Amino acid sequence: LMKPNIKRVINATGVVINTNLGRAPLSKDVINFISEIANGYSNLEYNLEEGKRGSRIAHIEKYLNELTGAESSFVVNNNAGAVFLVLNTLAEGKEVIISRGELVEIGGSFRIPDIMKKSGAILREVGTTNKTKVSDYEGAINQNTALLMKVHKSNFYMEGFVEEVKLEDLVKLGHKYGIPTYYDAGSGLLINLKEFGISVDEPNFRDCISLGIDLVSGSGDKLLGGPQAGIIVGKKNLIEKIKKNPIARALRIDKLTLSGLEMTLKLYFEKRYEDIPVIRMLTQDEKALRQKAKRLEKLLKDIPGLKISVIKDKAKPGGGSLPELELPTYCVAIRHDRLSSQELSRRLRLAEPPIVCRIREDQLLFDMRTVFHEDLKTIKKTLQELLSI
Amino acid sequence: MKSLMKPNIKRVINATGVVINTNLGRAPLSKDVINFISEIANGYSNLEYNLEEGKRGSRIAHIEKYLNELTGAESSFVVNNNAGAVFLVLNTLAEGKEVIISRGELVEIGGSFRIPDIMKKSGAILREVGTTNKTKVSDYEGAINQNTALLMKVHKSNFYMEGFVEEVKLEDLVKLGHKYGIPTYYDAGSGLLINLKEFGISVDEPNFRDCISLGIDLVSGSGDKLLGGPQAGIIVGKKNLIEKIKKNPIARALRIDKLTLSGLEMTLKLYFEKRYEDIPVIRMLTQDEKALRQKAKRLEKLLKDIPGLKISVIKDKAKPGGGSLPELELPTYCVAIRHDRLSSQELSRRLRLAEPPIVCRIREDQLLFDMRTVFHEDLKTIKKTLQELLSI
Ligand SMILES: [K+]
Ligand SMILES: [Pt+2]
Ligand SMILES: [Pt+2]
């Protein structure tokens, strides 16, 4: 093979946070900065003022602190690690209370009880799958309770007869017994969504911090729309213990992500949301989508055996973050006389660049939500090369 | 006390359009059944007797024949309620032993019923496997050991999950159980008797016959849910196991009453006779869309003459099963009413205080009557009830 296996793939699934397709894409502004810091040497671990070594995370935490309002903050390889670290540091040998309904598998390799076991912490599971009350948490408190933990169900959701302990209650319960409260938000949403005209209950750092939760973690590649990372924020007392754990060194973030992260956080401090693609995509205007949808169909009419439509559909745009959410978008629907849709999808994934699309009832769909403007021309040229042969 | 001069349990007209309603008494009974119940209650009977042999007999006997035939299990048994069945199954086969179950199937149904809580009081030992959202065969098999007494699956009747989710195919469980020689218990909960797709309602909901022929060793369910009968815990399965269960002294504490046994038998006989329309819970879920409309405009016809009354007829998607089919979404015709003098919040409040009461849905200060759960004899009574409240 002359070719590298890692390829740019055209996402037509209309799924913005896609665990399979590389999660959050990055803004050209961020990547340029990353590219700059990677092209030569730098002040990675250095103080230019004093002429000696300095802490790498230092640059970042300041932003996090003022953005989230938490006393201190830290960042490690990924949220998986965040969880592992937080547990291993605070709960080794001791008991961590958690709802039977928040023991989650995210991805293929991550399971709360599995990482938790490996951490050295002792799982104490309370309540039921579908309903969990405050009593259940309190009931399970004892001498060896180190931690009150909540995990946000980022990849799935429950409906029907359902209950859940209000975080406030959890903070309350924590304060009573003097037990720290750890919240794995996971989506790493930085700020309240309702500020962008998207009304959702999705917990963010800032808000769940000001709720009095002692520790909150999340990924950087999800709702934060940054590079992969485990983000931790909370009580300085705690973060301090965390940083000091030798394991934290094995979880230490790389130069690239660090740079990538800091640029991302600058954008947020400067309130330039449109400049982080996950946010832009999820707040894209319903008109902007039809405008894109029709723009593509204009390029598709001239090719043979091709049936082009454009529909309006309720999709669930956030894959690994906002599972409940349903938003309307415009899909460009296409069909060929000679080829079944399943056969076409298969060829599209094998194309260069590959094209991954949603199928509905033997009707091949491209959801514009997650398609770029530079992608359109490339789908034309890629469709004709397969079908005009 | 003053409120003692009259009974508190009253008939109540349900306009919530919610067929299986935990609050409003669950499944109503057909008059055929009620008559039969009334007949066996009115005097003495063969309850525990063998008229052939002139000596005492099992009460369950009457019923077991029907269940065994309908579901295709070797033997069957009936206790007070499904909670009890679950309690009894576990206390019989798993006391002091381990029961493997998915972390996603540890349910709270009702306020007072929690699998892990009752399983504990059961004497059984809970070995929970997998995760909330995803559970694989691996999880089940990996937790098997010397003290493993049971592989258990509980059907999520009152809630459901969406997103990244995994579940073990029943077939694989059975295959896993046959491998290690461990019995498999399915708490269906819904006690649905026959496949729903036969009535034009396409859903995955498990039924007795189908889950038995798949090689599950024990299946239980409620009587007053999708079975459309009176309250009961129904167990069907392998004779060797039913036997062990029947002999548990606790099963006498859970022994069913003359009334439900009667009601149950007639209910089942209706199933044998394939007269589904004569069991309200199935009739109400299988009602034709036209029929609902037909019924909705026949109501509107009666209410036009009432002063201050604005009346429309809408078409809406509702969720008819409360405690059995939470996913199921079905279209129905509601009859919507509005008054100029009374707020709908105040009008609903008065309707519940009526004789007979009337419970309906409220949506943005508009009052909804869902035709799904309204009987034909109830229309007239809604007219007379409204005019009495509004005119007076
Ligand atoms: K890294
Ligand atoms: Pt009283
Ligand atoms: Pt009195």
For residue B3, give the ligand nearest its CA: 2
In terms of phi and psi (left: phi > 0; alpha: psi -120 to 50; beta: otherwise), the region of B282 is alpha
Of the partner residues A105, A106, A128, the one whose CB lies closest to the CB of residue B116: A128
Residue of B nearest to A130 (CA): B107
Q: How far is CA B29 from the centre of its chain?
A: 12
Written as six digits, the tokens of B111 are: 């306020």
CB A170 within 8 A of CB A181: yes
The Cα–Cα gap between B287 and B370 comes to 13
Same domain for B30 and B18: no
A158 touches B at CB < 8 Å: yes
Domain boundary pick from B262, B286, B310: B286
Check if A113 contacts B (Cβ < 8 Å): yes
Helix (H, G, I), strand (E, B), or coil: what is residue A274? helix
The number of residues making up chain B comes to 392
Q: Which of residues 121-140 of A touch B (CB under 8 A)?
A: 125, 128-131
CA-CA-CA-CA dihedral for B342, B345, B349, B350, to nearest 10: 10
Nearest-angstrom CA–CA distance, B179 and B169:
16
B185, B217 contact by CB (below 8 A) = yes
Q: How far apart are CA A203 and CA A182, in angstroms?
A: 13
Indicate the DSSP class of residue A180.
-
**Single-letter code of the amino acid located at B326:** P
* Terminal alpha carbon distance of chain A: 24
Asked if residues B325 and B205 have their Cβ atoms less than 8 Å apart, the reply is yes
* Cα–Cα–Cα angle for A294, A297, A300, rounded to 5 degrees: 165
Q: How many domains would you assign to chain B? A: 2
Give yes or no: residues A266 and A138 share one domain: yes
As beta bridge partners, residue B111 has: none
* Chain B residue numbers touching A100 (CB-CB < 8 A): 103, 106, 116, 128, 132
Q: Mutate which of A15, A100, A109, A129 to test chain B, going by most B C-beta atoms within 10 A?
A: A129
Q: For this experimental structure, what is the resolution in angstroms?
A: 3.2
Which B residues, 285 through 344, put their C-beta within 8 Å of a C-beta on chain A?
Answer: 326
B15/B129 same-domain check: no
Q: Cβ(B92)–Cβ(B244) under 8 Å?
A: yes
Phi and psi, residue B239, nearest 5°: -50, -50
Q: Using CB atoms within 10 A of its CB, is residue A75 exposed (0-12), middle (13-18) or buried (19+)?
A: buried
Cα separation, B364 vs B203, whole angstroms: 31
Q: Determine the angle formed by the axes of helices B377-390 and B344-352, rounding to 10 degrees.
A: 120
User: Which of A103, A121, A20, A132 is CA-nearest to residue B139?
Assistant: A103
Question: Measured between alpha carbons, how far is residue B181 from residues B39, B124, B145, B317 in Å?
Answer: 47, 18, 11, 46
User: How far apart are the C-alpha atoms of B58 and B50, rounded to whole Å?
Assistant: 8
Beta strand pairing call for A145-151 and B148-154: unpaired
**Per residue in B281-302, is it b (16+ CB within 10 Å) or e — as a string?**
bbbbbebeeeebeebbeebbeb
Mark yes or no for CB contact A128/B115 under 8 Å.
Answer: yes
**Chain-centre distance of CA B275, in angstroms?**
19
How many other CB atoms are there within 10 angstroms of residue B126's CB atom? 17
Is A368 in contact with A330 (CB distance < 8 Å)? Answer: yes
Under 8 Å between Cβ of B17 and B371 = yes
Select from B243, B238, B246 the least CA-distant residue to B212.
Answer: B238
What share of residues in chain A are helix, strand, coil (percent, to 5)? 40, 20, 40
Whether the Cβ atoms of residue A103 and residue A126 lie closer than 8 Å to each other: no
Q: Judge: B131–A153 Cβ closer than 8 Å, yes or no.
A: no
B108·A130 Cβ contact <8 A: yes
Check whether residue B186 and residue B318 sit in a common domain: no
Contact (CB<8Å) A104/B131: yes
Three-class HEC string of B27-96: CCCCHHHHHHHHHHHHCCCCCCCECCCCECCCCCHHHHHHHHHHHCCCEEEEECCHHHHHHHHHHHHCCC
Cα–Cα dist B278/B334, whole Å: 23
A155 touching B (Cβ < 8 Å): yes
The one-letter amino acid at B230 = P
Q: Assess A247–B contact: CB distance below 8 Å, yes or no.
A: no
Quote the CA–CA distance of A216 and A208 in Å, as a whole number: 8
CB A65 within 8 A of CB A76: no
Nearest to B163 among A102, A131, A323 (CB): A323
Q: Are residues B159 and B53 both part of a single domain?
A: yes
Of residues A319, A321, A318, A329, the one with CA closest to residue A368: A329
CB-based contact, B158 to chain A, within 8 Å:
yes
Alpha carbon dihedral B219, B224, B227, B230, in 10-degree steps, equals 110
What are the distances in angstroms from CA B298 to CA B293, B337, B382?
A: 8, 14, 12
Provide the residue range defining the domain that includes B119: 24-286
Helix (H, G, I), strand (E, B) or coil at B112: coil
Nearest to A162 among B114, B159, B164 (CB): B159
When scoring B117, B118, B131, B152 by the number of chain A Cβ atoms within 10 A, the one with the most, hence best to mutate, is B131
In degrees, rounded to 5, the angle at the alpha carbon of residue B11 between the alpha carbons of residues B360 and B257 is 125
Residues B29 and B163 reside in one and the same domain: yes
By what technique were these coordinates determined? X-ray
B172 in contact with chain A, both atoms CB, cutoff 8 A: no
Structure-block tokens of residue B63: 């019923």
Rounded to an integer, what distance in angstroms lies between the CA atom of residue A54 and that of residue A60? 13
Under 8 Å between Cβ of A8 and A351: no
Spell out which residues of chain B touch residue A20, defining contact as CB-CB under 8 Å.
none
Rounded CA separation B233/A138 (Å): 33
d(C-alpha A206, C-alpha A223), whole Å: 14
Q: Of the residues A254, A283, A312, which one is the last residue of a structural domain?
A: A283
Residue of B nearest to A151 (CA): B132
By C-alpha distance, which of A85, A14, A367, A49 is closest to A231?
Answer: A85
Interface check A202 vs B, CB under 8 A: no
* Residue found by looking up tokens 């409204």 in the block: B386
CATH of the domain at A70: 3.40.640.10
Query: What kind and span of H or E run contains B279?
Result: none
CA-based nearest residue to A386, from A350, A337, A357, A335:
A350
State the Cα–Cα distance between residues A340 and A333, nearest whole angstrom: 14
Say if A380 is an interface residue toward chain B (CB within 8 Å): no
- Helix segments in chain A, DSSP class H: 28-39, 58-68, 79-90, 112-119, 134-139, 167-177, 205-210, 236-244, 247-250, 255-269, 277-282, 286-300, 341-349, 373-387
* Residue type (1 letter), B63: I
Residue A291 and residue A164 in one domain: no
Of B109, B132, B163, nearest to A103 by CB-CB distance is B132
Q: What single-letter amino acid sits at B52?
A: E
Same domain, A242 and A101: yes
For residue B104, the chain A residue with the least C-alpha distance is A129
Please, are residues B157 and B322 in contact by the beta-carbon 8 Å criterion? no
* Torsion over CA: A203, A204, A205, A209 (sign): negative
DSSP string, B283-319: HHHS--HHHHHHHHHHHHHHHTTSTTEEEEEEEEEE-
d(CA B321, CA B328): 7
Distance CA B98, CA B183 (A): 12
DSSP β-bridge partners for residue B50: B55
Per CB-CB distance under 8 Å, the chain B contacts of A159 are 159-162, 326
Shortest CA gap B82–chain A (Å): 18
For B319, nearest residue in chain A (alpha carbons): A160
CATH of the domain at B385: 3.90.1150.180
User: For residue A278, which phi and psi values (nearest 5 degrees)?
Assistant: -55, -40
CA B104 – CA B171 distance, rounded (Å): 18
- Alpha helix locations (H) across chain B? 31-42, 61-71, 82-93, 115-122, 137-143, 170-180, 208-212, 239-246, 258-272, 280-285, 289-303, 344-352, 377-390
Strand order in the sheet with B184-189: B75-79, B233-237, B218-222, B184-189, B148-154, B98-102, B125-129
- For β-strands A355-360 and A10-12, DSSP reports them as parallel
CB B280 within 8 A of CB B372: no
Residues B240, B219: contact at Cβ < 8 Å?
no
Nearest by CB to B133, which of A113, A156, A163? A156
Round to whole Å and give the CA distance between B96 and B98.
7
Displacement of CA B114 from its chain's centroid (Å) = 17
A228 C-alpha to ligand 1 centroid (Å): 7
Residues after which chain B is broken (C–N above 2.5 A) are none
CB contact under 8 A, A161 and B105: no
Q: What does the block give as tokens for B30?
A: 């057909």
Same domain, B323 and B270: no
What's the CA gap between B280 and B377, in Å, rounded?
14
Chain A CA closest to residue B22: A161
Contact B108 A101 (CB under 8 A): no
Nearest-CA neighbor of A233 among A60, A56, A75? Answer: A75
Identity of the amino acid at B210: D
φ, ψ of residue A22 in degrees (nearest 5): 95, 15
For residue B5, report the distance from its CA to the centre of ligand 3, in Å: 6
How many A-B residue pairs are in contact by the CB < 8 A criterion?
Answer: 81
Residue B36 CA to residue B115 CA, distance in Å, equals 35
B197 and B333 together in one domain: no
Ligand nearest to the CA of A253: 1
User: Backbone phi, then psi, for A196, in 5-degree steps?
Assistant: -100, 15
Asked if B191 and B325 touch (Cβ cutoff 8 Å), the reply is no
Looking at the partner chain, which of B106, B133, B160 has a beta carbon nearest the beta carbon of A105? B133
Interchain pair B133, A155: CB under 8 A? yes
Contacts of A99 (CB under 8 A, 6+ apart): A125, A126, A127, A132, A136, A137, A150, A164, A165
Do B128 and A98 meet the contact criterion of CB atoms below 8 Å apart? no
Contacts 24+ apart (CB under 8 A), A336-341: A336/A305, A336/A306, A336/A307, A336/A387, A337/A305, A337/A307, A338/A305
Are B120 and B259 part of one and the same domain? yes
- Amino acid residing at A276: I
Least Cα distance to B63 among B241, B251, B264, B209 occurs for B264
Answer yes or no: do A113 and B133 touch at CB < 8 A. Answer: no
Q: Which of A100, A162, A163 sits opposite B132 (nearest CB)?
A: A100
What spacing in Å lies between the alpha carbon of B7 and ligand 3's midpoint? Answer: 13
The single-letter DSSP state of residue B181 is T
Name the domain boundary from A283, A318, A334: A283
Q: Is the CA virtual torsion B162, B164, B168, B170 positive or negative?
A: positive
A323 chain-B contacts, CB cut-off 8 A: 162-164
Residues B206 and B57 in one domain: yes
N-terminal to C-terminal alpha carbon distance within chain B: 31
List, in sequence order, every residue forming a beta bridge with B369; answer none if it has no partner.
Answer: B335
